[PDB]
Amino acid sequence: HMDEYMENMNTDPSKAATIDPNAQLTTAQLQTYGDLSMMEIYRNYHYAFTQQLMGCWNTTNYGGRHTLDNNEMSRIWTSFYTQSLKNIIDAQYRTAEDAEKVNINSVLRIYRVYLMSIITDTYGDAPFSEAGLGFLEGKFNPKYDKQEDIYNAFFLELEDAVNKIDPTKDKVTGDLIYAGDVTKWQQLANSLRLRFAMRISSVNPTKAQTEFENALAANGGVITDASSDALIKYMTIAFSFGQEAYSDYRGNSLSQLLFGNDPANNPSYLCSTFFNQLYNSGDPRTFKISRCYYDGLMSATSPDNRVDITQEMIEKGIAFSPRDPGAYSWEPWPTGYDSDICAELAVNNPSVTATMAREVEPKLANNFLKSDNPGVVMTSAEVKFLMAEATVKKWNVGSVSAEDLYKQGVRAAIDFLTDNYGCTATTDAEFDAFIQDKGAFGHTDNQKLEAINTQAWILHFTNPAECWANVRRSGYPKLKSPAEYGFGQYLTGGTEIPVRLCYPVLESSYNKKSYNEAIERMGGTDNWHSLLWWDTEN
Numbered sequence: 001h002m003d004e005y006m007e008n009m010n011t012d013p014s015k016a017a018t019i020d021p022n023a024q025l026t027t028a029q030l031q032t033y034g035d036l037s038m039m040e041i042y043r044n045y046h047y048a049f050t051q052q053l054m055g056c057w058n059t060t061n062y063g064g065r066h067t068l069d070n071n072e073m074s075r076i077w078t079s080f081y082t083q084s085l086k087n088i089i090d091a092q093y094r095t096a097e098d099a100e101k102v103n104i105n106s107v108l109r110i111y112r113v114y115l116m117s118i119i120t121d122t123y124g125d126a127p128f129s130e131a132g133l134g135f136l137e138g139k140f141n142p143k144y145d146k147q148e149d150i151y152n153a154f155f156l157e158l159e160d161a162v163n164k165i166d167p168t169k170d171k172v173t174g175d176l177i178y179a180g181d182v183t184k185w186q187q188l189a190n191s192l193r194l195r196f197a198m199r200i201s202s203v204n205p206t207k208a209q210t211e212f213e214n215a216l217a218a219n220g221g222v223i224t225d226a227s228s229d230a231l232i233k234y235m236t237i238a239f240s241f242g243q244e245a246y247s248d249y250r251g252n253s254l255s256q257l258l259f260g261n262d263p264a265n266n267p268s269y270l271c272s273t274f275f276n277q278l279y280n281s282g283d284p285r286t287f288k289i290s291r292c293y294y295d296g297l298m299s300a301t302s303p304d305n306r307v308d309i310t311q312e313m314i315e316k317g318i319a320f321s322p323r324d325p326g327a328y329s330w331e332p333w334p335t336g337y338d339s340d341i342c343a344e345l346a347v348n349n350p351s352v353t354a355t356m357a358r359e360v361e362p363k364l365a366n367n368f369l370k371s372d373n374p375g376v377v378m379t380s381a382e383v384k385f386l387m388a389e390a391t392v393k394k395w396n397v398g399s400v401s402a403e404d405l406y407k408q409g410v411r412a413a414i415d416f417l418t419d420n421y422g423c424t425a426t427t428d429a430e431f432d433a434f435i436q437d438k439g440a441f442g443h444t445d446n447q448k449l450e451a452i453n454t455q456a457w458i459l460h461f462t463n464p465a466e467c468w469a470n471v472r473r474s475g476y477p478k479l480k481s482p483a484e485y486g487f488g489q490y491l492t493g494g495t496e497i498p499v500r501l502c503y504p505v506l507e508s509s510y511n512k513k514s515y516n517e518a519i520e521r522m523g524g525t526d527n528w529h530s531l532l533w534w535d536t537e538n
């Protein structure tokens with residue numbers, strides 16, 4: 001089926017919805033979190049590997065118990081190379097060096113870098129420079145570019161893009177991140193430069209510092225307040241898991257999937273690592289991100305009519321039972337209680353029970369289960385954390401103290417929930433009480449890097465690609481294998497939490513030489529325990 005492979009991996013004008021560059025951008029943006037098939041990878045792997053969710057069958061089975069599954073691992077590769085990245089490549093190619101299309105071209109180059117970053121931060125070496133060119137240039141069988149070289153190209157592409165943007169030129173018309181404000185595109189591009197500079201800070205400290213400092217000084221500057229956060233706009237659409245929903249990117253499919261195809265039996269239960277970080281630190285977001293719900297009246301298609309038992313649990317002294325890494329909602333079975341709230345519901349309703357069991361395991365709050373939840377690309381809060389870490393590393397990034405940058409990042413991360421998810425606001429007094437106690441910055445460099453990156457991990461909950469990248473890069477939080485929680489007997493894929501995903505096996509058939517050459521650079525095996533180039537330690 002080389003024919004289908006070739007058709008699917010290159011933009012075919014005769015079959016493609018459109019080759020208009022502005023339209024290509026719109027559809028690529030929506031795909032990022034709108035592709036319901038692709039989002040399975042995050043529920044299956046990332047959210048377990050970062051120990052944020054655990055207990056849903058899918059999360060625990062795949063990532064929580066290290067089940068290697070080449071088809072499940074393939075989703076980012078397939079989805080991006082056969083749709084958004086290929087289409088962005090086609091659009092970029094057609095607008096390159098056209099003086100009348102410098103803004104759309106520059107924006108395409110920025111978003112091309114962003115999508116490619118997700119691919120390389122998942123798999124390592126991957127097609128980039130030669131990708132998507134079969135119909136444009138007759139160039140098939142693209143080489144897998146080395147990750148080091150991909151990162152070099154990120155910095156160069158982003159720099160050139162910010163230098164070519166000119167608000168006097170072409171209008172960017174279907175842009176669901178910034179409604180064509182190309183100044184905000186410059187801010188995003190320079191912020192991505194910060195992200196990628198910090199990413200390479202362990203493997204190449206000299207280059208990291210230089211790129212970080214270059215980005216701060218670059219045309220348009222960086223994202224310095226939340227109004228320039230890069231968030232893809234999604235519409236409210238009913239959640240459907242019928243066959244036609246898999247081609248509908250209008251709604252946030254990550255939110256759909258975290259609600260679930262089986263929402264009553266397999267909701268998004270929180271992992272103990274994350275719930276306990278929040279709860280034990282008195283984090284104001286504990287019960288903004290999570291609640292305990294009884295779902296006996298909840299429909300199969302939306303998180304309406306759930307019964308919030310969180311406050312009753314607290315009043316009655318019932319312990320929350322978040323899921324350790326490796327645990328299912330049913331294993332170990334939690335200690336429950338008889339609910340007064342649910343007993344009232346049970347009056348003259350045989351559907352309902354008053355006896356809570358798995359309802360004592362914290363669940364993702366309804367605010368994060370909406371079709372119109374944003375698609376998070378990058379935030380001002382993250383920029384603050386990157387600046388804080390650069391400052392601890394003694395880079396030359398301005399006059400603000402590392403501690404103040406850190407505190408600004410935490411405040412922004414908390415406010416992000418208020419502004420974008422309808423969560424209850426956090427007051428100055430609440431913020432100060434937290435930052436003065438368990439949210440404090442710390443005294444030693446290691447304490448400070450731990451605080452920064454732990455706070456980043458919480459911020460990246462809604463951005464699982466970046467969450468997993470930053471956990472691997474920074475080493476924080478320090479996570480233990482499911483083996484350390486009692487689940488070692490089940491870890492078929494090996495004891496250690498995976499640090500990358502393997503290449504799709506069909507690459508062996510359809511791009512064999514390139515595939516074999518990439519695998520040879522890792523020593524000749526394709527192993528999800530192999531560290532990526534930027535990832536210097538497990």
Ligand SMILES: [Mg+2]
Binds near residue numbers: 471473535536
């Ligand atoms: Mg690492």
Ligand SMILES: [Mg+2]
Binds near residue numbers: 520523
């Ligand atoms: Mg070998």
